């Protein structure tokens, strides 16, 4: 910056995306990393193997893949996080990965978070990811019953606020009060697809 | 004081870190630039005379001071302070040591001979190289004889051979 004695930080540190202390602790594991990242619209899930010249991503997907199975919920709610985790876990199991270590980056590990929803989906697909028993969200939140209850109360109380706050659901054709059943159908579709693929 | 031949020769590393030297002497030279020191008035002066060392050695602070007084007094008396700029170009950074039994100067100075022979500070000197510029004079070309005489008188007080080099600015 000013003078030769200024030490410019690492590029990823100064862009604010890599905590190198946590990255070094993760790299000590020598296991594949289940990288989970959040955006304002989507959730990114990757299975990464670190190499000296650059990381190798075995499988990488955001929540745009759920449209292939017919998702009509939000892109990055807890149910979408679970379905993305299921797909990424099945793909990783196909490509030969059987264990992974959760990598949430700069996100906080609060219990019931979407990163743990993705981890639960990956675990249910057949990939072992170590975790505490008190961080994975409840099955009600994974099915999306919180979204349904909020939509029901909003419809009862303020219908115009309901339409404004869930317009994209109504454009997609799924009212938010029917989210758990649709989650069940999509999860059945994904499970049947990848299990038939695994059998074949 | 000892004869200057005792400290003329460079025989060891420089001894200048005053944060590690105990009781280091002060530099007694009161000023280093003589005459018309402001560059706006030095723009008039076009001749440069340089008293330059011929050998490698050490010049004591007192020797540098004596040369400075003799040259500055001659230049003031015969050229006037408004017609010259004189700079003593070297600073006596080196600290000289002497090994001698003495007064209250440590309990290891009370042992005689070469036992605990690391001396106490005894003065200051400037370590010079061949071709090093000891005295730098800026002057108008009419005063060349007086400037050479002042440089000769200054050279008479120094412990090493020197020479005068005249050139244009």
């Amino acid at each position: 910056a000013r003078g030769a004695r200024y030490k410019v930080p690492f590029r990823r540190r100064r862009e604010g995306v890599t905590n190198y202390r946590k990255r070094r602790k993760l790299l000590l594991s020598r296991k594949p990393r289940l990288v989970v990242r959040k955006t304002n619209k989507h959730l990114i899930a990757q299975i990464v193997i670190a190499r000296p010249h650059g990381d190798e991503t075995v499988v990488g997907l955001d929540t745009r893949v759920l449209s292939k199975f017919g998702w009509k919920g939000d892109e990055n709610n807890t149910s979408a996080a679970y379905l993305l985790g299921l797909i990424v876990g099945y793909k990783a199991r196909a490509k030969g990965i059987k264990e992974a270590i959760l990598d949430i980056g700069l996100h906080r590990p609060t219990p019931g978070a979407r990163v743990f929803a993705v981890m639960k989906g990956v675990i249910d697909a057949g990939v072992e990811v170590p975790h505490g028993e008190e961080v994975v969200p409840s099955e009600e939140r994974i099915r999306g019953e919180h979204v349904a209850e909020y939509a029901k109360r909003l419809k009862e109380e303020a219908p115009e606020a309901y339409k404004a706050r869930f317009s994209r659901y109504l454009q997609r054709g799924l009212p938010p009060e029917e989210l758990p059943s649709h989650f069940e159908e999509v999860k059945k579709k994904i499970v049947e697809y990848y299990e038939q693929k695994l059998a074949k | 004081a000892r004869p200057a031949r005792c400290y003329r020769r460079i025989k060891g590393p420089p001894y200048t870190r005053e944060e590690y030297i105990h009781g280091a002497p002060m530099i007694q030279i009161p000023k280093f630039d003589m005459g018309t020191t402001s560059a706006a008035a030095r723009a008039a002066f076009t001749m440069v005379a340089k008293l330059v060392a011929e050998e490698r050695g050490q010049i004591r602070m007192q020797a540098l001071e004596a040369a400075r007084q003799i040259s500055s007094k001659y230049l003031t008396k015969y050229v006037g302070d408004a017609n010259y700029y004189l700079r003593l170009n070297v600073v006596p950074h080196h600290v000289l040591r002497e090994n001698r039994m003495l007064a209250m100067a440590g309990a290891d100075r009370l042992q005689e001979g070469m036992r605990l022979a690391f001396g106490s500070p005894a003065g200051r000197a400037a370590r010079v190289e061949p071709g090093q510029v000891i005295f730098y004079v800026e002057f108008k070309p009419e005063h060349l004889a007086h400037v050479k005489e002042a440089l000769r008188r200054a050279a008479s007080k120094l412990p090493i051979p020197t020479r005068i080099v005249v050139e244009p600015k």
Binding site: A4, R5, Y6, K7, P9, F10, Y20, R23, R24, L27, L28, A50, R51, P52, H53 | -
Partner: protein, 98 residues
């Protein structure tokens, strides 16, 4: 006085770093998987000095003999005596000269 011999007793220049080298170092040295028979160079990292080998092994070429948990066992020589350096990968570099 005779020379004192701490574990790091003449290591000012060897453990100093330039201003452009300050702070954390890159993590690529962690990701080299050395097999038995590989050749490595002992290049001490000053930021992890507690696990670094002695200063007498800096710049020496060793042969990986095995792995102990997360460190590597390296067979090297100091003059003519065989020495065993058990050190983590952050103080090692692969030897490219064979």
């Amino acid at each position: 006085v005779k020379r004192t011999h701490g574990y790091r007793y003449k290591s000012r220049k060897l453990l100093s770093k330039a201003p452009r080298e300050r702070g954390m170092s890159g993590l690529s040295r962690l990701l080299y998987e050395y097999k038995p028979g590989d050749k490595v160079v002992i290049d001490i990292d000053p930021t992890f000095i507690s696990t670094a080998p002695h200063r007498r092994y800096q710049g020496k070429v060793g042969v990986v003999i095995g792995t102990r948990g997360r460190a590597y066992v390296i067979e090297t020589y100091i003059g003519d005596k065989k020495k065993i350096i058990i050190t983590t990968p952050e103080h090692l570099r692969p030897h490219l000269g064979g």
